[PDB]
Amino acid sequence: GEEKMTNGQLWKKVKDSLIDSNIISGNENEEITVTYVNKTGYSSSVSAYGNNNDDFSSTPSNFSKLKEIDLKKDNVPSDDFNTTVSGEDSWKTLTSKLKEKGLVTDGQTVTIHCNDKSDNTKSSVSGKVGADLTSGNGTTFKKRFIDKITID
């Protein structure tokens, strides 16, 4: 068990989740600031773009826990321009990709907003690690307008 890694190597394992899902293109036009915390009370944000891997820090490998995420996307080109996500779906694959690398704990409440600035609509979805969604599901939201994620 060599589940120790840097900012870059951690954040990659928290990026490639969203690649499996339909939430990001993985272009040079999306950035994700993932905040996490170690055994000690020290938070750490790591902010990087969806082209390439991330490695711009030589940070310690005391990883133990998570904190929020801040999300950013530009005006996306044709490939992914129509992309929307079935709300539940945009929590499902994401969470289903993180325990693979031990990057959630067994009951965390991962909460995802949508901030749609089209027809005056916003919402959120929420569940636990392992269950299905007791809040949010049965609905769909646009890719470009999902930009705020927190954990309990």
Side-chain angles (χ1 to χ4, degrees), residues 1-141:
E2 276 286 285
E3 59 266 22
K4 288 201 184 77
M5 65 280 165
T6 53
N7 266 197
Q9 294 341 287
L10 188 184
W11 170 107
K12 255 256 289 127
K13 302 170 209 296
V14 182
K15 195 243 293 206
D16 88 79
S17 33
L18 296 311
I19 302 283
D20 202 315
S21 203
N22 197 24
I23 299 157
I24 60 89
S25 312
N27 293 357
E28 54 270 273
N29 87 345
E30 309 177 290
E31 185 249 90
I32 304 95
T33 301
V34 180
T35 303
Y36 74 110
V37 55
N38 41 37
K39 290 194 78 182
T40 31
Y42 309 130
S43 36
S44 41
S45 52
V46 48
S47 40
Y49 279 74
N51 101 121
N52 215 283
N53 76 146
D54 185 61
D55 65 309
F56 72 124
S57 185
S58 75
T59 16
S61 51
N62 302 313
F63 169 96
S64 301
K65 187 150 166 73
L66 280 308
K67 231 185 86 87
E68 65 258 19
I69 307 153
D70 282 275
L71 208 307
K72 284 185 176 302
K73 294 168 259 65
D74 203 66
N75 289 129
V76 153
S78 306
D79 295 280
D80 208 26
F81 203 20
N82 300 280
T83 297
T84 61
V85 284
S86 316
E88 181 216 49
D89 192 340
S90 32
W91 176 104
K92 290 282 299 190
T93 0
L94 182 175
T95 53
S96 200
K97 283 289 125 190
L98 286 171
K99 211 307 196 187
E100 289 214 79
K101 303 305 181 198
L103 302 182
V104 289
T105 59
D106 189 58
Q108 285 183 299
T109 355
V110 188
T111 306
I112 330 194
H113 275 74
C114 52
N115 306 332
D116 286 89
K117 205 76 184 76
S118 183
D119 302 277
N120 308 292
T121 63
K122 296 195 291 190
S123 201
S124 55
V125 311
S126 35
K128 269 93 71 287
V129 177
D132 209 58
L133 277 121
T134 205
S135 294
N137 70 71
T139 318
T140 180
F141 308 128

